[PDB]
Amino acid sequence: LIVTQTMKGLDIQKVAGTWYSLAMAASDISLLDAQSAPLRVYVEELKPTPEGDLEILLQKWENGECAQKKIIAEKTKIPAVFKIDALNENKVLVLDTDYKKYLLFCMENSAEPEQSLACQCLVRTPEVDDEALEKFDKALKALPMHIRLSFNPTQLEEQCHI
Numbered sequence: 410l411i412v413t414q415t416m417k418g419l420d421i422q423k424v425a426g427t428w429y430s431l432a433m434a435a436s437d438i439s440l441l442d443a444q445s446a447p448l449r450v451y452v453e454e455l456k457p458t459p460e461g462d463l464e465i466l467l468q469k470w471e472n473g474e475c476a477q478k479k480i481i482a483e484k485t486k487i488p489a490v491f492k493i494d495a496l497n498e499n500k501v502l503v504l505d506t507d508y509k510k511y512l513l514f515c516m517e518n519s520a521e522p523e524q525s526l527a528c529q530c531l532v533r534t535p536e537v538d539d540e541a542l543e544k545f546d547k548a549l550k551a552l553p554m555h556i557r558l559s560f561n562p563t564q565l566e567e568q569c570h571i
């Protein structure tokens with residue numbers, strides 16, 4: 410009744426650097442349909458703060474404009490799962506990553522989430538890496554997704570992806 414798959418041995422210090430949202434999938438169309446939807450977030454980079462926590466700088470369409478956005482993902486007992494401030498706990502779990510080339514993550518609710526959830530295939534360079542997109546699918550095969558987006562190299566370079 411949640412997201413089952415996670416990353417064991419997650420060194421959140423080897424995940425740091427630049428990242429590109431190549432694909433995103435949500436359990437509901439409304440979460441990802443328009444540019445203004447809430448979990449239509451593009452990911453600039455991950456900064457692992459000294460003391461574990463992860464800092465995301467990201468891009469969203471908020472009104473009219475691609476706004477940069479800094480967010481703080483707070484480590485939990487489980488290396489792969491982090492927590493975002495706050496209203497009702499938004500948890501991020503890292504499904505999979507090879508650190509160097511791709512990263513699979515999902516965000517859901519601690520309510521819990523029957524059954525709302527956004528996921529993303531972060532990559533390092535602006536390229537269609539199909540061997541991570543294949544991994545994105547097979548980890549979404551295990552889940553209730555009703556929208557998948559994916560982007561090109563040219564949209565991977567603009568802010569909010571054109």
Ligand SMILES: CCCCCCCCCCCCCC(=O)O
Pocket residue numbers: 447448450452455463465469480482493501502503514516
């Ligand atoms: C391992 C970390 C992967 C990157 C996680 C970033 C996702 C957090 C986005 C939270 C949504 C921001 C907009 C909002 O709160 O309305």
